[PDB]
Amino acid sequence: HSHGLFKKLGIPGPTPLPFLGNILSYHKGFCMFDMECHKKYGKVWGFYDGQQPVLAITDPDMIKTVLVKECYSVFTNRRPFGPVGFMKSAISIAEDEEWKRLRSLLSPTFTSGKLKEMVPIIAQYGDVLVRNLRREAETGKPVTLKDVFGAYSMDVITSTSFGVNIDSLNNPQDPFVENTKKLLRFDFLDPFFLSITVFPFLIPILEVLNICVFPREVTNFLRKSVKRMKESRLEDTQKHRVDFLQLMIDSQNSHKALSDLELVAQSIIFIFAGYETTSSVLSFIMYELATHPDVQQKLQEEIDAVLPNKAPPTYDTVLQMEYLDMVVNETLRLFPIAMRLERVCKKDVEINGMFIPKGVVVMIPSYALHRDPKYWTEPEKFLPERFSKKNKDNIDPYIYTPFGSGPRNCIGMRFALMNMKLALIRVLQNFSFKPCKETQIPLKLSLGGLLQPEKPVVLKVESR
Ligand code: HEM
Ligand SMILES: O=C(Nc1cc(C(F)(F)F)ccc1-n1ccnc1)C1CCC1
């Protein structure tokens, strides 16, 4: 039907099948498809997700025009992904003016001043992490990274978002833990979302039936859980609070006001954005450290230098360690878990000599651009020196976009980096991580819609 747009514009791309587009080319995942397309179609190419035209762009100037320059005018919203319900008020899903209102009311919550006030909290569960990690080391068994880092992320969110201070690895089946553990990422190549892509006309049907991609058990629990602590346990209390909920509650005190429904929407999305992301990235970081022990030692030397004798990490301490920042950044280059930055074109626009039709999804292949031979040397190699002070200025901010760019970039980039580094400091201060017999030395990525290892990463943990 609409599979004639990219031919009439002279834009190359794979030839679309009726009713399906190039969806069948996702048999090797999102990232492998963009890598191959980049090789055989050049700098700009197009494809169809069902009947949805998608234009991929790789020019840094064009990317900056979409993400930064023309963000408010045209490239304001992302691609709608499915039946959302009340979660349509989340900032990552909001569109047009409501997003601008929500971005304004939530930006002060992510101030670096607020992050510093949350450092003692997430450092508390860094200590909790090594205690439970020492148990897994004294057991002498290969440790699964997703489980220890998952529980650390659980502790961080439940404390920094609501204030429920609870250990998670040794205290499962807790009400908050059991439900928030169900807020798992969306595999957009699974049967449901693949069917949704082929039948986008069924999304209105699912919405009126009150069928939502977010599990209703988790959403209704958290809206009630917020309700019990929003007023029934907060107004009858004069203690100080530092969690995200309190900062959003205080926003309601004095655009417009955050609806109590809107507040629950943002609180859930911060959990959904922060739970498996940190865990996946931290797992990826420990993989590169173990397979390259030279950088693990140098990082352990730098950490022990700034913090002698396992000194408590602090906000100003973390910003000082630059080899830690190099390791984090280089992992995010190899594994940008978003895999893709997408914007929806609200009107006919010509940018950088290219005409973009209305309704086309403009996509930035972050995984492909991070491994392009044009801008990177030995792209498959883990070389943290790329982000050294001497060499970290040759990198274009629009070819390396792990947290996105422009006004719609990750609002929790500082929180994520501070949280992940704080774990890396405490964990490395007390343990050394080495490969196992069960460890996959040539780590293979999944073929689904998530940037995750094929088999779970397992490593050997020894106390220093
Ligand atoms: C842990 C590692 C994380 C990574 C790699 C990451 C990456 C990203 C990326 C690539 C985007 C899209 C930006 C673009 O389209 O230009 C994004 C959006 C967003 N992220 Fe994250 N993110 C992370 C963690 C978090 C956390 C922990 C939070 C919550 C505190 C968060 C909140 C958000 C929000 C709210 C948006 C939407 C921004 C908006 O719509 O204006 N992210 N993130
Ligand atoms: O989960 C992901 N993206 C994402 C999606 C949504 C939404 F579409 F459901 F609304 C909301 C928030 C985020 N998110 C995560 C981190 N920062 C923001 C990717 C990371 C691997 C899968």
User: Going from the N-terminus, what domains does the chain have, and what CATH number goes with each?
Assistant: 1-464 (1.10.630.10)
- Phi, psi for 270 (deg, rounded to 5): -65, -40
Contact assessment for residue 47 and residue 37, using Cβ atoms and an 8 Å cutoff: yes
Tell me 77's DSSP state: B
Contact assessment for residue 10 and residue 45, using Cβ atoms and an 8 Å cutoff: no
Report strand pairing: 458-463 vs 354-356: unpaired
Experimental method: X-ray
Q: How far is the CA of 121 from the centre of ligand 2 (A)?
A: 24
Of 30, 77, 92, 266, the one to substitute when testing ligand 2's pocket (max ligand atoms within 8 A of C-beta) is 92
Q: How far is the CA of 102 from the centre of ligand 2 (A)?
A: 17
Beginning with the edge strand found earlier in the chain, give each strand of the sheet holding 143-144 in spatial order.
Answer: 143-144, 458-463, 431-435
CA distances from 437 to 48, 122, 158, 269, 440 (A): 43, 33, 35, 38, 8
Contact assessment for residue 230 and residue 249, using Cβ atoms and an 8 Å cutoff: yes
Distance in angstroms between the alpha carbons of the first and the last residue of the chain: 63
Binding residues for heme, by number, are: 410
The experimental resolution of this structure, in angstroms, equals 3.0
Report strand pairing: 361-364 vs 52-57: parallel
**Which amino acid is it at 209?**
L
Q: Which two tokens stand for residue 443?
A: 């780590």
Preceding residues of all breaks in the chain (C to N beyond 2.5 angstroms)?
254
Residue 417: closest CA among 112, 140, 194: 112
- Phi, psi for 353 (deg, rounded to 5): 75, 10
Helix, strand, coil shares, percent, the chain, to 5? 50, 10, 40
H or E element: which one contains 327?
helix 322-334
CA distances from 105 to 26, 52, 235, 252, 429 (A): 38, 33, 22, 9, 38
Residue with structure tokens 């003692």? 120
197 lines ligand 1 (CB under 6 A): no
47 lines ligand 1 (CB under 6 A): no
Contact assessment for residue 426 and residue 440, using Cβ atoms and an 8 Å cutoff: no
